């Protein structure tokens, strides 16, 4: 038998290959040959001495390393399933190392059932350790091994939906790392919590982020990280706001927390961050819906924002710009919507035939009739339902907003209605609202036949 | 609609049978399972014939100004170098590879075209360890992508140039082919490892004006190793005995693919060389899809998982 002088020169020759050929035309190759050459060497062909089963343990890891480098593990499969059955017939580490290379074979398996049966067992080898039955006093390589089994579950959870399961077993993991970068797994922890609906831990996880980066520890793409976290931060502003719609301390620390984000925005250049600026700032100056006065002040605000946006992005022109500024058109255009709610509430409530206010009612009414028109120019005249939206608010507007000359209600109703059958007779499926246009349609057809004969005589 | 074209290597234990052009039979060990795609090119096709039928008819209609996205990919041993570079350059029509040919006809097509005019931008990179790397210059290294107001997405470092003639595209095309024999000499090992892309962007004037757009793509992708390529509806298992910080970077990054919810935003953050590719599909573009592959007898599995992916290209 190998004695121990031996068994050590052997194992710090297979280790120091081993761990040598990875940090750099042939190597691997050869480091195979060199690592069977190893497995020559063992000699393959309490009670007795427990150091040769602690050696035959480890040279069946390093067995199981072997494989993985020829990624044609199956015969290791087998002498590692023998292995394991021989140490499942009898321990304080050799049970984990069987269970991490257990693990990583049925993980090769590439079988969902089986890999996850073998991992609910391998749960129940990890609390049984965990029932707590060198580097420092053995618990240092223990704790790395225990980040490695942790992520591996995790990745046998995300194998599954199983998404409640993964999350909290992935703040056990970030967690666990953080007993002695980060602010991404926290991002993507609380990016689970906007797709949830709890948000007191997101809020907790939020200022675990903010701690962990202002003592990051130091002796980057923290950018778009941080971006990221104001991002998050009007997503929980939008969370609230939901709850509340579907007080004015929530709308300063949006203001301040907006503020900083369009600060560490343009610091940060960027091409998209610019489209995720738009997005979340025409959420915030739409559904802060709570005044009068100050209501309008938000509106030009909105209105500056888009202002800013718009006089390099008519030189920028993708078609992707056309895609993503049909949204946001789109999105100027519910904007557009509720001004003109606005308007007739002032209207209201207010001396409206004024000369200047009239000149600017119109002003944005013409102005959303062109981005209209810029949304028609979107289909080619020389995934729809957002167009039957659009068709429903161009036929309102064709509809409602005309103080000129009544000649061209009479052509816009019957553009809209000709655009009515077009959609009936193209799609032959049903709207969200569009029975409500098809009656004012009606309505509208039989009363601009009848008015204006009487009218505009 | 996606016109998917393929091109397989003759294998000369292939275990494949093709009873048509558009469809394979392929005999696998659990049971035999048949695969259908729109075009399948097989042993007995020429080089001549791909280029003619495939090329020529999609060339034809990337001329009316939208990016019919050919491009080269493939694993390990895939036919690739091959078809496209050559062997070696050892003036040979057969051995020297569809590119010139594909030069040719498109100054043909720009000659008998012409009535700032129709004008061409040609590009390499190769992108190794995740750093993009010109062939031009040696200080060209780790220059940045950046997608520009232009619609033209590139590299900040790079320096196009001008091509009058296809002798012209010849000489720089084997100068940058010769460079790439020097990088075989140089810290590109493998050509597996690296992610070469060749490309071709030609531009056009209405009459003078309006810009019309076709790109020829040649990529060189990750092969048959197991390390990379990012998404995978096999093994999606990170696999390794590394340090759980970077396996927990991406355990992170493919949590967040659990955390899309129940529209996805196409990634941009997930690699610069899918960013360089997502401005082609998805793209406002004709979807023609000229794509090389290789079916191998060895990683049988692994081929598996690239018939899956050409089936993921159909959907
Ligand atoms: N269509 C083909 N006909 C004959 N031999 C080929 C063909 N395609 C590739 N080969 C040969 O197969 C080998 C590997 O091809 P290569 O293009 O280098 O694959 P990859 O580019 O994926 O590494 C080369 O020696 C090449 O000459
Ligand atoms: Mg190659």
Same mark, same amino acid.
């Given at each position: 038998?190998?004695?121990?002088?031996?068994?050590?020169?052997?194992?710090?020759?297979?280790?120091?290959?081993?761990?040598?050929?990875?940090?750099?035309?042939?190597?691997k190759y050869s480091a195979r040959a060199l690592l069977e050459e190893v497995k020559a060497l063992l000699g393959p062909a309490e009670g007795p001495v427990a150091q040769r089963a602690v050696r035959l343990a480890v040279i069946e890891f390093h067995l199981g390393v072997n494989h993985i480098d020829t990624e044609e593990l199956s015969a290791?499969?087998?002498?590692?399933?023998?292995?394991?059955?021989?140490?499942? !017939?009898?321990? =304080?580490?050799? %049970?984990?190392?069987?269970?991490? *290379?257990?693990?990583?074979?049925?993980?090769? @398996? /590439?079988?969902?059932?089986?890999?996850?049966?073998?991992?609910?067992?391998?749960?129940?080898?990890?609390?049984?350790?965990?029932?707590?039955?060198?580097?420092?006093?053995?618990?240092?390589?223990?704790?790395?091994?225990?980040?490695?089994?942790?992520?591996?579950?995790?990745?046998?959870?995300?194998?599954?939906?199983?998404?409640?399961?993964?999350?909290?077993?992935?703040?056990?993991?970030?967690?666990?790392?953080?007993?002695?970068?980060?602010?991404?797994?926290?991002?993507?922890?609380?990016?689970?919590?906007?797709?949830?609906?709890?948000?007191?831990?997101?809020?907790?996880?939020?200022?675990?982020?903010?701690?962990?980066?202002?003592?990051?520890?130091?002796?980057?793409?923290?950018?778009?990280?941080?971006? !990221?976290?104001? =991002?998050?931060? %009007?997503?929980?502003?939008?969370? *609230?706001?939901?709850?509340?719609?579907?007080? @004015? /301390?929530?709308?300063?620390?949006?203001?301040?927390?907006?503020?900083?984000?369009?600060?560490?925005?343009?610091?940060?250049?960027?091409?998209?961050?610019?489209?995720?600026?738009?997005?979340?700032?025409?959420?915030?100056?739409?559904?802060?819906?709570?005044?009068?006065?100050?209501?309008?002040?938000?509106?030009?605000?909105?209105?500056?924002?888009?202002?800013?946006?718009?006089?390099?992005?008519?030189?920028?022109?993708?078609?992707?710009?056309?895609?993503?500024?049909?949204?946001?058109?789109?999105?100027?255009?519910?904007?557009?919507?509720?001004?003109?709610?606005?308007?007739?509430?002032?209207?209201?409530?207010?001396?409206?035939?004024?000369?200047?206010?009239?000149?600017?009612?119109?002003?944005?009414?013409?102005?959303?009739?062109?981005?209209?028109?810029?949304?028609?120019?979107?289909?080619?005249?020389?995934?729809?339902?957002?167009?039957?939206?659009?068709?429903?608010?161009?036929?309102?507007?064709?509809?409602?907003?005309?103080?000129?000359?009544?000649?061209?209600?009479?052509?816009?109703?019957?553009?809209?209605?000709?655009?009515?059958?077009?959609?009936?007779?193209?799609?032959?499926?049903?709207?969200?609202?569009?029975?409500?246009?098809?009656?004012?349609?009606?309505?509208?057809?039989?009363?601009?036949?009848?008015?204006?004969?009487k009218m505009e005589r | 609609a996606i016109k998917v074209f393929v091109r397989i290597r003759p294998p000369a234990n292939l275990s494949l049978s093709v009873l048509s052009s558009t469809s394979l039979r392929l005999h696998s060990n659990p049971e035999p399972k048949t695969f259908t795609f729109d075009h399948v090119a097989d042993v007995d096709?020429?080089?001549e014939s791909v280029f003619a039928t495939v090329a020529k008819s999609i060339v034809e209609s990337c001329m009316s100004g939208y990016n019919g996205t050919i491009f080269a990919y493939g694993q390990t041993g895939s036919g690739k170098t091959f078809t496209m570079m050559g062997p070696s350059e050892s003036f040979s029509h057969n051995l020297?590879?569809?590119?010139?040919?594909?030069?040719?006809?498109?100054?043909?097509?720009?000659?008998?075209?012409?009535?700032?005019?129709?004008?061409?931008?040609?590009?390499?990179?190769?992108?190794?360890?995740?750093?993009?790397?010109?062939?031009?210059?040696?200080?060209?290294?780790?220059?940045?992508?950046?997608?520009?107001?232009?619609?033209?997405?590139?590299?900040?470092?790079?320096?196009?140039?001008?091509?009058?003639?296809?002798?012209?595209?010849?000489?720089?095309?084997?100068?940058?082919?010769?460079?790439?024999?020097?990088?075989?000499?140089?810290?590109?090992?493998?050509?597996?490892?690296?992610?070469?892309?060749?490309?071709?962007?030609?531009?056009?004037?209405?009459?003078?004006?309006?810009?019309?757009?076709?790109?020829?793509?040649?990529?060189?992708?990750?092969?048959?190793?197991?390390?990379?390529?990012?998404?995978?509806?096999?093994?999606?298992?990170?696999?390794?005995?590394?340090?759980?910080?970077?396996?927990?970077?991406?355990?992170?990054?493919?949590?967040?693919?659990?955390?899309?919810?129940?529209?996805?935003?196409?990634?941009?953050?997930?690699?610069?060389?899918?960013?360089?590719?997502?401005?082609?599909?998805?793209?406002?573009?004709?979807?023609?899809?000229?794509?090389?592959?290789?079916?191998?007898?060895?990683?049988?599995?692994?081929?598996?998982?690239?018939?899956?992916?050409?089936?993921?290209?159909?959907?």
């Amino acid at each position: 038998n190998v004695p121990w002088a031996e068994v050590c020169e052997k194992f710090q020759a297979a280790l120091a290959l081993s761990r040598v050929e990875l940090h750099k035309y042939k190597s691997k190759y050869s480091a195979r040959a060199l690592l069977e050459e190893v497995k020559a060497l063992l000699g393959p062909a309490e009670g007795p001495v427990a150091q040769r089963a602690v050696r035959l343990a480890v040279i069946e890891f390093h067995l199981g390393v072997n494989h993985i480098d020829t990624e044609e593990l199956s015969a290791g499969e087998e002498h590692l399933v023998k292995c394991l059955r021989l140490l499942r !017939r009898y321990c =304080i580490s050799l %049970c984990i190392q069987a269970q991490n *290379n257990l693990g990583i074979l049925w993980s090769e @398996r /590439e079988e969902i059932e089986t890999a996850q049966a073998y991992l609910e067992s391998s749960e129940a080898l990890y609390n049984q350790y965990m029932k707590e039955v060198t580097e420092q006093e053995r618990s240092k390589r223990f704790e790395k091994v225990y980040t490695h089994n942790l992520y591996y579950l995790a990745q046998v959870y995300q194998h599954l939906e199983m998404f409640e399961k993964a999350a909290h077993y992935c703040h056990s993991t970030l967690k666990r790392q953080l007993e002695h970068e980060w602010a991404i797994n926290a991002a993507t922890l609380s990016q689970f919590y906007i797709n949830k609906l709890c948000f007191m831990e997101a809020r907790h996880c939020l200022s675990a982020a903010n701690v962990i980066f202002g003592q990051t520890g130091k002796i980057h793409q923290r950018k778009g990280e941080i971006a !990221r976290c104001w =991002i998050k931060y %009007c997503l929980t502003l939008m969370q *609230n706001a939901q709850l509340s719609m579907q007080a @004015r /301390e929530l709308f300063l620390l949006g203001q301040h927390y907006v503020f900083e984000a369009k600060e560490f925005f343009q610091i940060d250049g960027y091409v998209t961050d610019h489209i995720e600026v738009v997005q979340d700032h025409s959420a915030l100056f739409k559904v802060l819906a709570f005044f009068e006065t100050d209501m309008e002040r938000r509106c030009k605000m909105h209105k500056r924002r888009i202002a800013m946006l718009e006089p390099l992005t008519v030189d920028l022109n993708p078609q992707y710009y056309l895609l993503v500024n049909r949204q946001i058109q789109f999105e100027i255009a519910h904007a557009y919507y509720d001004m003109m709610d606005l308007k007739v509430a002032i209207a209201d409530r207010l001396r409206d035939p004024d000369s200047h206010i009239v000149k600017k009612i119109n002003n944005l009414n013409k102005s959303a009739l062109k981005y209209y028109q810029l949304f028609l120019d979107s289909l080619r005249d020389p995934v729809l339902r957002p167009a039957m939206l659009a068709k429903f608010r161009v036929a309102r507007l064709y509809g409602k907003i005309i103080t000129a000359d009544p000649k061209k209600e009479l052509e816009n109703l019957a553009t809209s209605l000709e655009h009515y059958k077009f959609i009936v007779d193209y799609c032959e499926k049903h709207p969200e609202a569009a029975q409500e246009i098809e009656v004012e349609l009606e309505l509208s057809k039989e009363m601009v036949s009848l008015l204006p004969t009487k009218m505009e005589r | 609609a996606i016109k998917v074209f393929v091109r397989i290597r003759p294998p000369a234990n292939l275990s494949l049978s093709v009873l048509s052009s558009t469809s394979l039979r392929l005999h696998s060990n659990p049971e035999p399972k048949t695969f259908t795609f729109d075009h399948v090119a097989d042993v007995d096709t020429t080089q001549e014939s791909v280029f003619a039928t495939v090329a020529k008819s999609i060339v034809e209609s990337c001329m009316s100004g939208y990016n019919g996205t050919i491009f080269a990919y493939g694993q390990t041993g895939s036919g690739k170098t091959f078809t496209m570079m050559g062997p070696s350059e050892s003036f040979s029509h057969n051995l020297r590879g569809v590119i010139p040919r594909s030069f040719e006809y498109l100054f043909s097509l720009i000659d008998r075209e012409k009535e700032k005019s129709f004008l061409s931008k040609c590009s390499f990179i190769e992108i190794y360890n995740e750093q993009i790397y010109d062939l031009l210059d040696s200080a060209s290294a780790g220059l940045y992508l950046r997608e520009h107001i232009k619609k033209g997405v590139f590299v900040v470092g790079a320096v196009e140039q001008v091509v009058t003639s296809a002798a012209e595209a010849y000489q720089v095309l084997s100068g940058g082919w010769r460079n790439r024999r020097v990088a075989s000499t140089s810290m590109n090992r493998e050509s597996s490892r690296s992610h070469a892309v060749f490309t071709i962007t030609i531009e056009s004037m209405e009459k003078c004006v309006n810009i019309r757009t076709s790109l020829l793509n040649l990529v060189d992708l990750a092969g048959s190793e197991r390390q990379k390529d990012t998404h995978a509806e096999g093994m999606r298992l990170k696999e390794a005995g590394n340090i759980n910080r970077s396996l927990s970077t991406l355990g992170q990054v493919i949590t967040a693919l659990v955390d899309v919810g129940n529209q996805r935003h196409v990634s941009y953050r997930d690699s610069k060389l899918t960013f360089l590719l997502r401005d082609s599909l998805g793209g406002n573009a004709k979807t023609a899809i000229i794509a090389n592959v290789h079916p191998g007898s060895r990683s049988f599995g692994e081929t598996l998982s690239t018939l899956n992916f050409a089936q993921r290209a159909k959907l």
